[PDB]
Amino acid sequence: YELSPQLEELITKVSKAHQETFPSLCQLGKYTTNSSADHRVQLDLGLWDKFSELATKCIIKIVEFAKRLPGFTGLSIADQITLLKAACLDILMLRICTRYTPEQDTMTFSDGLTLNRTQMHNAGFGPLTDLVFAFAGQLLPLEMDDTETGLLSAICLICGDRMDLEEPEKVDKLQEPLLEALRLYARRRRPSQPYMFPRMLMKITDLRGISTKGAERAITLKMEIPGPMPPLIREMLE
Ligand SMILES: O=C(O)c1ccc2cc(-c3ccc(O)c([C@]45C[C@H]6C[C@H](C[C@H](C6)C4)C5)c3)ccc2c1
Numbered sequence: 001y002e003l004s005p006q007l008e009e010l011i012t013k014v015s016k017a018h019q020e021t022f023p024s025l026c027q028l029g030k031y032t033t034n035s036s037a038d039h040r041v042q043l044d045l046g047l048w049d050k051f052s053e054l055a056t057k058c059i060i061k062i063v064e065f066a067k068r069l070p071g072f073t074g075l076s077i078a079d080q081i082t083l084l085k086a087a088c089l090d091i092l093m094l095r096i097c098t099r100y101t102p103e104q105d106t107m108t109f110s111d112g113l114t115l116n117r118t119q120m121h122n123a124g125f126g127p128l129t130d131l132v133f134a135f136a137g138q139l140l141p142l143e144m145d146d147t148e149t150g151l152l153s154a155i156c157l158i159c160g161d162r163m164d165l166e167e168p169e170k171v172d173k174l175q176e177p178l179l180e181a182l183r184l185y186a187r188r189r190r191p192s193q194p195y196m197f198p199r200m201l202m203k204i205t206d207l208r209g210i211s212t213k214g215a216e217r218a219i220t221l222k223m224e225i226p227g228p229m230p231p232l233i234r235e236m237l238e
Contacts, residue, residue, distance in 0.1 A: 017068035018150030021061040030114045036122040043224045047123035054109045056230045071174045086162040088236045089211035100136040128217045151182040
């Protein structure tokens with residue numbers, strides 16, 4: 001016993017918020033491009049234009065997802081912004097990792113655009129490509145479903161340990177039921193895999209590491225593009 005209708009409602013609210021701001025790989029009509037498909041180059045300007053537009057669109061969806069999380073809009077507008085700026089890269093990574101097709105070694109974006117590893121390199125990832133693909137491959141054995149990805153994204157976002165929070169205690173209190181919800185959900189879905197909940201939480205460390213490497217890549221990439229990065233990407237990286 002000790003089940004809670006409030007905790008069940010939180011699981012569904014978070015899963016739906018994620019699913020409604022992020023299509024599943026199976027619901028997308030994949031399409032390709034022949035742009036710099038067979039050889040790595042410093043930067044393909046055509047691919048960067050399409051990729052950075054897809055990144056802007058996903059940052060907007062991440063903000064929509066956040067505003068749907070119970071209690072998020074109850075935090076001060078400064079803390080809402082602080083939390084989004086701090087976790088957006090972590091969430092973009094979790095999201096693109098669910099869009100990895102190992103057989104074809106491709107990533108699929110929300111309009112269905114499917115890029116191979118060389119194309120992901122040429123679109124802007126550059127020296128970060130292989131690490132991102134390695135991260136996606138190591139997330140695959142966890143076999144997380146949409147609810148679990150949604151809950152883990154909400155846990156990364158609602159984090160009281162981010163710098164410059166006005167009400168970190170309030171953020172910590174809001175994160176507590178998200179952790180309870182993920183543990184309850186994960187254990188009930190796969191009771192024969194009790195290590196799944198701590199494996200998901202331990203992934204946050206490598207997710208932060210790959211986000212730090214993302215920020216490092218934005219520095220060098222800036223020197224390669226002809227103009228400034230899209231404004232919402234700049235909001236994320238400041
Ligand atoms: O359509 C989608 O469903 C979708 C999902 C996940 C995404 C994830 C990224 C995404 C994920 C991790 C990243 O490190 C980045 C970058 C960080 C900085 C340095 C590079 C150029 C840009 C600045 C973007 C790489 C973008 C980009 C676009 C994405 C689009």
